[PDB]
Design a protein around this nucleic acid. Structure first.
Lengths: 96, 52, 77, 96, 52
DNA sequence: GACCCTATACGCGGCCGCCCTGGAGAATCCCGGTGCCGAGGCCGCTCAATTGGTCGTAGACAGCTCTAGCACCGCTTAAACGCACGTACGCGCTGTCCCCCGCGTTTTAACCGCCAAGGGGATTACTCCCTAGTCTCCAGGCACGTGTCAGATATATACATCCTGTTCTAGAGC
DNA sequence: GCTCTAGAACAGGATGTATATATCTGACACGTGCCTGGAGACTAGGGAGTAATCCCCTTGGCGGTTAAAACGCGGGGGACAGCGCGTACGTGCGTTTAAGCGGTGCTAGAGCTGTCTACGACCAATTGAGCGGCCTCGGCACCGGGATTCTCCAGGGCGGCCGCGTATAGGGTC
């Protein structure tokens, strides 16, 4: 049962997902979540495909940048595992 | 972007190449810092403490 | 020599206003450096604003526009 | 002689410098620093008093916010002291 | 700001009261997050771990 | 005063954890071959600009002038920076049991291929009521004078907390 | 059972922040003296509204297939702290020291005034390539094949610590 180390495949996935620009969240769940969020604002609202696409690109970019900031917070705290306190600190630093 | 494509050997400019060109130059990095580039990803930077 | 003109007790009071209990000894130089960088950016913007108006003195008004164009708007001036 | 524990004088200074809005940075060194910085861009450049005041207020508020973020990062790292790495992390998250 | 001045035992609004009014209320602090008020200071708050 | 025994530290030999090296399964890059769909080039053709003079003008401009910032004059009291004692801690190591990662399996919904189809963005023919411009002026509005009360600086004195002194009671020793 | 060490909590003294006037210069805001700027009201034609398709395109419906997510499972990783510590600030000081404030110019400079030349959308008109659409073509997407190396198990070299041999100074004895 050859098994790789818990942390080498992590770095390999980091390199793979940093080199590639393919999107990570599937389009259908993100579209459904966008419709769920928007149904509280406007009743019977339609989303064009390019609108959902752009929203997905922006959302993944924001999440990726926040993940780099939380990772930097983790290494700053002499740690490897990110925790929701890192996300809260990163949000509060930018005043979000 | 053409230089980044040369390092990648593709002859066509890709949004990844444009993102690499934007975020590699320092002046372009501070100019376009609050700017999102679609289908661009990020630089493949890994901290030294993460690498074995 | 005016970069060191600002005092260590001034930086301590600045951190006290920021709710910091204690200050490390090697952070004073880093705070001075980042203050120099911020002042350099704001002063460069104010200098460009002053030179655009054919003016030789930096008024307070283009300073608050220089700060506001950087997302750091100033009130009271 | 009377001795105070490390921290209560610090907390008292925090309180007394947070209730009042006095000018912590002295006028003359900040003015001299402003003239020194501006002399590299434009020679024989003047600064009115209200301009120096405004720049000093903006700088002091910015440094206070940066120190707040620095202390926030220090508490996130389970640390009471604030280190230059904390300032670097806060500026990197803030994109400065 | 007048409420903050009332908690300050005075009847004239001065910019520290305006800063306290802006930062205390959530929506005005969020609106004026990137906004700096001169002669205003900051909120008189102390972190939990700092107190003995 | 000299000889023998004994405790102590210095030098040397041995052992084991620490620090590395091949074999092999597997992730990733270069390459042989194909393709087809996206990118580059060409045919009309249709929509914004510039030359031929334009004119009220946004700007430019010499004399002036008017409020003021920089240079240094003694200082005066908030202060800062050099030094010593100590108690808050930063951060290397610490054992471990809970927390996260890595193949296996299933299942589970995402991506895809084609089509009805009904609500919705775009612009043409036409109209409308509401908006830029101009003539006159008057009540809302900007700048100078000044009384004084809200606020600023300050001494003295009261309630509140820190601390050192002291009294008392519990428990070990003879 | 008698004598005595030591921990523990209020008792009063020291010090800190804070209320209470005492007062004092200081600008808040009304009064006033104007004053400039939109309110009232034509003139009217340019942008917005209404429709009127119009299409178009995004929502939903037939699944098919399969990359990927959810299910625990197993061993390795490591996040959250307790102790000693030493080490780098916290907190006091005596000493600088340089920063805070005020009177008297002073001309650099920012407007400021009235004056003077150049300057850009339009008065009306193309026209030459921008772009929609069509033809062509080529380069990375796709499919495997193969090489290189990433990296986890299960064996070979290497230095620090402990035990032992031995030199040496101190003490006992005749």
């Amino acid at each position: 049962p050859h098994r790789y180390r818990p942390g080498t495949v992590a770095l390999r996935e980091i390199r793979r997902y940093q080199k590639s620009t393919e999107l990570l969240i599937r389009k259908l769940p993100f579209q459904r979540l966008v419709r769920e969020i928007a149904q509280d604002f406007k009743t019977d609202l339609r989303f064009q495909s390019s609108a959902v696409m752009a929203l997905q690109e922006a959302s993944e970019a924001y999440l990726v940048a926040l993940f780099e900031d939380t990772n930097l917070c983790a290494i700053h705290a002499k740690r490897v595992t990110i925790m929701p306190k890192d996300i809260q600190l990163a949000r509060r630093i930018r005043g979000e | 972007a053409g230089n980044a494509a040369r390092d990648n050997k593709k002859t066509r400019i890709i949004p990844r190449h444009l993102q690499l060109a934007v975020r590699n130059d320092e002046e372009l990095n501070k100019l376009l810092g609050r700017v999102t580039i679609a289908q661009g990803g990020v630089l493949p930077n890994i901290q030294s403490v993460l690498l074995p | 020599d005016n970069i060191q003109g600002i005092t260590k007790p001034a930086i301590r009071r600045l951190a006290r206003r920021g709710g910091v209990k204690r200050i490390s000894g090697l952070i004073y130089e880093e705070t001075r450096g980042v203050l120099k960088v911020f002042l350099e950016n704001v002063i460069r913007d104010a200098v460009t604003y002053t030179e655009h108006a054919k003016r030789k003195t930096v008024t307070a008004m283009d300073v608050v526009y220089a700060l506001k164009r950087q997302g750091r708007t100033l009130y009271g001036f």
